[PDB]
Amino acid sequence: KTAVESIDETLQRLVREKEMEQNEKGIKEQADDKMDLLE
Amino acid sequence: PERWEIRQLIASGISAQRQTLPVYAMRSELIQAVRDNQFLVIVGETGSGKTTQITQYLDEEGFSNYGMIGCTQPRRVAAVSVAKRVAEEVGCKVGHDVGYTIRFEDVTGPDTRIKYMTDGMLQREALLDPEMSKYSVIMLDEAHERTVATDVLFALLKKAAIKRPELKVIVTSATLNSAKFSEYFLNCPIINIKTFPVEVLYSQTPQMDYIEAALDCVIDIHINEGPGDILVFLTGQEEIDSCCEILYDRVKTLGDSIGELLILPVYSALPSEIQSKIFEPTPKGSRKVVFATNIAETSITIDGIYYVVDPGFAKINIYNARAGIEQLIVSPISQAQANQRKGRAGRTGPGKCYRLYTESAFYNEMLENTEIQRQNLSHTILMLKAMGINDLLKFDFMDPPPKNLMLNALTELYHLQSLDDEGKLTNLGKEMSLFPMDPTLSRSLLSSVDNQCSDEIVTIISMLSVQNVFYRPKDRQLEADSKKAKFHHPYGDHLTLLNVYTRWQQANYSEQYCKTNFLHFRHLKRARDVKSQISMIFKKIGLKLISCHSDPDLIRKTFVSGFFMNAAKRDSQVGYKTINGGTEVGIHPSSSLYGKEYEYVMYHSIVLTSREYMSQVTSIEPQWLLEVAPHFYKAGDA
Amino acid sequence: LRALKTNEESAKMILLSDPTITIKSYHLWPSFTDEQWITIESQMRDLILTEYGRKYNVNISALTQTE
RNA sequence: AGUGAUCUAGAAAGAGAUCCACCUACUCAUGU
């Protein structure tokens, strides 16, 4: 039914939000590291 | 910046017909309820006969004392037109045994038994008589539209019932869902009553893209479905214009195999003549396609609609009580609205309704009903304190607003001196409650005598109680702006309102000199009748009409003496910047900004669009802020 | 070897922890059994990422190939 | 109806705080 579509859309939006967060959190983590060492 | 460009320039160089309505066939049931119960919910279907019939019902079943019956409508047009019709139905003179009442439009007299008024006007009556003693039954109609004035009347009348056994109260809705309303009025009964049966399509997957999906749905319906007009719903003018140009062009194209298709708009700004074009026939080999806002949800009909779209979005006011700020946000509709939309296909035959979302999202993801959780409460807290309600935070509200927005509203009213610190009505707050305005407008007006310009400030508060006056069509913005300049005042668009009203009252014109000076005649008329009504309240309450000989700085000081809170400094390295909240705004692209004494504005309206804008602005000397509200201009609180 | 390069004598004390487990004459590393190698590898991985967090104040690897 | 007027030029050793212009940039009111 529509519960599968709602759950899959919410899981896709949560996965893309976690991917954007984990892109903000490797390279950019160490960029924040270098900025905190400069502070 | 202006100065630097000048420096570089210098440096360089019939009776039986009404029987037939469905509510007749349950009139017996409708006594037995009315008779047995002090409060009653009735719920219909729009067309079933409730606005007309049920008040008449009540006036045979409940008759002679020195008393009236009110019916209450959220909509001026429904009050007026349904009172005209019900006067004919009785066979009585309009303004006599049946009458209106609307803001600055009363049509009742000492004969009126049956009184069909705006919700806002019954609420003002209840400021002057907190028992509504002059009514023996009060019927709050279209309660599903959950306006501010109906929700405050519902609250009030809850309490008034437990002071007056001889008051009976009838809440009338077009949304079958009464449970919420029964519960809120102490488990009160329900009585549940010509719409044809709408088919309802849903998308299998959430759309992300609802404009282009709505366009393609309307062309699909026009190819494949039999005769019947289409009603799209879309959220604002810019969107609606765009979809009218692109469904007009795509329909011309498919005219190489398909019938003729006439588009129209509809939205809140439209001139009257283009509004009237919505009602045209549906060419001849052919169909029509209204592209409306939510105005076509409830507030009219268009007679031949058989197919509704429904991208389930509208453009709704939202108010944050812990930023302090209203905005105007494209937002998912309520389930009640989605139902109304559907029921516009159904007036004239079976119908279909093509909902650009999932059945799961209708059932489970739209909020039931939409206004008290979407409002600045300042007006509401003035009205409650006039109603004697000393514990605002405890007031019995079927959905209580956030106690922060109530607290912010007392603090505004204290800085407007409507209340004292101890939350008690000053002589201003009394008199302000006598005017049907917001508190900032009312305060401005009141004080205007003591700025020697109460005629001028009466006229500007009348103007600011109506729309924008100035027509600017998307073809002829140069001609419209040329027109507008011949009333403009350089850094004083409030003074521009005074000038165009005075010119409309000039010994030189009416309708066709409105159209040839690109003015809304309907606005200017409405502002003239609200100027007449507000001058009658001024006389009634002893506020002397005053003018001077010609004094713009007096006009400025009066306006500041209401709108003090709504001030916005020029930034001196950046944009414009606001006294309350410390927002970073721009002057609205309607108005140039003479940056040489501009250095403070007073603004009418904050407008949220993708940027922050501030709209209808007039210059102020900041020294005249500090003298006219020293308690709000305390560095100390800053 | 990343554990020896990061913090040398800590990983040497982790190698030279149990005095029973010795090194044969032609071997380099102590002759552990397999669960003993799991314990050694777990302590070395914890040592690497412990001094990596204590050097670069980073929270955790948000991705497996990043780790 | 016009021609014609053409320096330089590299080897050894030693030295020497550099201090300065080649990419443009801004328009929504859902209602009453």
| Rounded Cα distance, B532 and B521, in Å | 16
Q: Do A2 and B359 lie within an 8 Å CB cutoff? A: yes
**CB spacing of B363 vs A9 below 8 angstroms:** no
- The whole-number Å distance from C29's CA to D20's C1' is 63
Check CB contact under 8 Å for B363 and A5.
no
Of B509, B617, B508, nearest to B559 by C-alpha is: B617
Judge whether B45 is annotated as a binding position.
yes
**DSSP states along B550-578:** S-HHHHHHHHHHHHTTSEEEEPSSSSEEE
Closest nucleotide (C1' vs CA) to B316 is: D30
Is residue C53 within 8 angstroms of chain A, CB to CB? no
C61: which chain A residues are within 8 Å (Cβ-Cβ)?
Answer: 26
User: What is the rounded distance in angstroms from the CA atom of residue B440 to the CA atom of residue B559?
Assistant: 9
Cα–Cα dist B278/B292, whole Å: 10
Chosen for mutation from B360, B362, B364, B365 (greatest number of chain A CBs closer than 10 Å) is B360
Q: What is the DSSP letter of B53?
A: I
A12 alpha-carbon distance from chain centroid: 12
Q: If residue B529 lies in a helix (H) or strand (E), which one and from where to where?
A: helix B521-540
CB–CB of C62 and A30 under 8 A?
no
User: For chain D, which bases have at least one atom within 7 A of a protein Cβ?
Assistant: 27-32
- Residue B49 annotated as binding site: yes
- The values of phi and psi at residue B556, to 5°, are -55, -55
CA distance B288 to C23: 92
Distance CA B604, CA B616 (A): 5
Say if residue B50 carries a ligand binding annotation.
yes
Separation of B538 CA and D19 C1' (Å): 79
Query: Cα torsion for B54, B59, B65, B70, to the nearest 10°?
Result: 40
Rg (CA), chain A: 16
CB pairs under 8 A between A and B: 19
> C61 in contact with A at a CB cutoff of 8 Å?
yes
List of residues 6+ apart from B363 with CB closer than 8 A: A2
Whether B359 sits inside 8 A of A3 (CB atoms) is no
Task: List the single residue in B with minimal CA-CA distance to A4.
Answer: B360
Under 8 Å between Cβ of B560 and B625: yes
The distance in angstroms from the start CA to the end CA of chain C is 17
DSSP B354: E
The one-letter amino acid code at B323 reads A
B329 touches strand D (CB under 7 A): no
How far is C-alpha B337 from the chain's CA centre? 17
* Residue B314: CB less than 7 A from any atom in strand D: yes
- Reference B519, options B530, B506, B532; nearest CA is B506
CB B50 within 8 A of CB B23: yes
**In whole angstroms, what is the distance from residue B98 CA to residue B115 CA?**
6
Q: Shortest CA–C1' contact from B604: which nucleotide?
A: D29
- Whole-number Å distance between alpha carbons of B231 and B292: 7
- Strand D atom within 7 Å of B76 CB: yes
Q: In this structure, are strands B135-140 and B68-73 parallel, antiparallel, or unpaired?
A: parallel
Which residue in the set A22, A25, A33 is minimally distant from C57, CB to CB?
A33
Asked if residue B471 keeps its beta carbon closer than 7 A to nucleic acid strand D, the reply is no
Instruction: Please provide residue B68's backbone torsions phi and psi, each rounded to the nearest 5 degrees.
Output: -125, 175
CA–CA min distance A7, chain B (Å):
11
Report the distance from CA of residue C48 to the C1' of nucleotide D15 in Å, as an integer: 55
Residues in chain C: 67
Those residues whose C-beta lies under 8 Å from the C-beta of residue B176, and which sit 6 or more positions away, are B43, B192
Residue B509 to residues B169, B337, B615, B637, Cα–Cα distance (Å): 48, 43, 29, 51
Instruction: Return phi, psi of residue B305, to 5°.
Output: -60, 130
- Please, what's the largest Cα pairwise distance for chain A? 54
How far is the C-alpha of C67 from the C-alpha of C63, rounded, in Å?
A: 6
Amino acid at residue number C39: T
Distance from CA of A2 to the nearest CA of B (A): 5
Handedness of CA B224, B230, B234, B239 (dihedral sign): positive
Decide if B107 contacts B91 (C-beta within 8 A): no
CA of C43 to C1' of D14 (A): 64
CA distances from B184 to B162, B189, B523 (A): 14, 11, 39
Check: CB of residue B486 under 8 Å from CB of residue B579: no
According to the entry, how was the structure determined? cryo-EM
Distance CA B429, CA B632 (A): 18
3-state SS record for B439-483: HHHHHHHHHHHHHCCHHHHHHHHHHCCCCCCECCCCCCHHHHHHH
Helix axes of B378-386 and B427-434: crossing angle, nearest 10 degrees: 100
Which of A1, A2, A11 to probe the B interface (max B CBs under 10 A)? A2
How far, in Å, CA of B181 to CA of B197, rounded? Answer: 26
Whether B360 sits inside 8 A of A9 (CB atoms) is no
| Interatomic CA distance for residues B294 and B344, integer angstroms | 11
Residue B68 in contact with residue B136, Cβ under 8 Å?
Answer: yes
What the block records as the tokens of B303 is 């007679």
Tell me which chains share at least 3 CB pairs under 8 Å with chain C: A
CA gap A35, A28 in Å, rounded = 10
A35, closest residue in chain C (CA to CA): C56
Distance B242 CA to D6 C1' (A): 76
Cβ neighbors of B101 (< 8 A, separation 6 or more) are B79, B107, B108, B115, B116, B117, B118, B121, B125
Nearest to B480 by CA among B471, B488, B492, B469: B471
* Interchain contact C56–A (C-beta under 8 A): yes
Structure tokens belonging to residue B197: 């049966």
Phi, psi of B406 (to 5 degrees): -65, -40
Chain A residues at the B interface, defined by Cβ less than 8 Å, are 1-3, 5-6, 9
Q: Which residues contact B199 (CB under 8 A, 6 or more apart)?
A: B350, B351, B352, B353
Nearest Cα neighbor of B244 from B307, B185, B292, B192 is B292
B194 is known to lie in a ligand binding site = no
β-pairing verdict for B305-308 and B352-355: parallel
Q: State the Cα–Cα distance between residues B434 and B542, nearest whole angstrom.
A: 12
The helix (run of H) or strand (run of E) holding residue B448 is: helix B439-448
Compute CA distances C52 → B541, B627, C7, C10, C58, whole Å.
Answer: 79, 63, 10, 14, 8
- Report the DSSP beta bridge partners of residue B571: none
**One-letter identity of residue A30:** Q
What is the tally of helices (H) and strands (E) in chain A? Answer: 2, 0
- Radius of gyration of chain C from Cα atoms? 14
Task: Determine the nucleotide nearest to B466 by Cα–C1' distance.
Answer: D32
Statement: the CB of B267 is under 7 Å from strand D: yes
Do the strands B313-320 and B325-332 form a parallel or antiparallel pair, or are they unpaired? antiparallel
Closest by CA position to B396, among listed B384, B408, B412: B384
Quick one: resolution in A?
A: 3.7
B295 touches strand D (CB under 7 A): yes
Beta strand B229-233 with B190-192 is unpaired
Query: Which tokens sit at B253?
Result: 């194209």
Q: Give the minimum alpha-carbon distance from B362 to chain A in angstroms, rounded to a whole number.
A: 10
CB contact at 8 A, B306 and B348: yes
Under a CB-based contact definition with an 8 Å cutoff, are residues B372 and B151 in contact? yes
B50 contacts B44 by C-beta, under 8 angstroms: yes
Please say whether the beta carbons of B383 and B357 come within 8 A.
no
Around Cβ B236, how many Cβ atoms within 10 Å? 16
Q: Decide if C62 and A22 are in contact by the 8 Å CB cutoff.
A: yes
Question: Minimal CA–CA distance to C20: which of C32, C8, C11, C12?
Answer: C32
Chain B, 156-185: which CBs lie within 7 Å of strand D? none
Separation of CA B162 and C1' D13 in angstroms? 119
Q: How far is the CA of B524 from the C1' of D32 (A)?
A: 15
DSSP B502-516: HHHTSTT-SHHHHHT
B376 Cβ nearer than 7 Å to chain D strand: no
Is strand D less than 7 A from the beta carbon of B236? yes
Neighbours of B469 (CB within 10 A): 23
Do B327 and B318 touch, CB atoms closer than 8 A? yes
Structure-token pair, residue C31: 């002759």
B540, B422 Cβ separation under 8 angstroms? no
Q: How far apart are CA B555 and CA B494, in angstroms?
A: 9
Contact C58 A33 (CB under 8 A): yes
* Residue B73 burial (10 A CB sphere; 0-12, 13-18, 19+): buried
From B195, B154, B181, B157, select the one nearest B44 (Cα to Cα): B195
Cα B185 to Cα B248: distance, rounded to the nearest angstrom: 50
Which residues in chain B are contacts of A4 at CB distance < 8 A? none
Spell out the residues 6+ positions from residue B254 whose beta carbon is closer than 8 angstroms to its own. Answer: B219, B222, B223
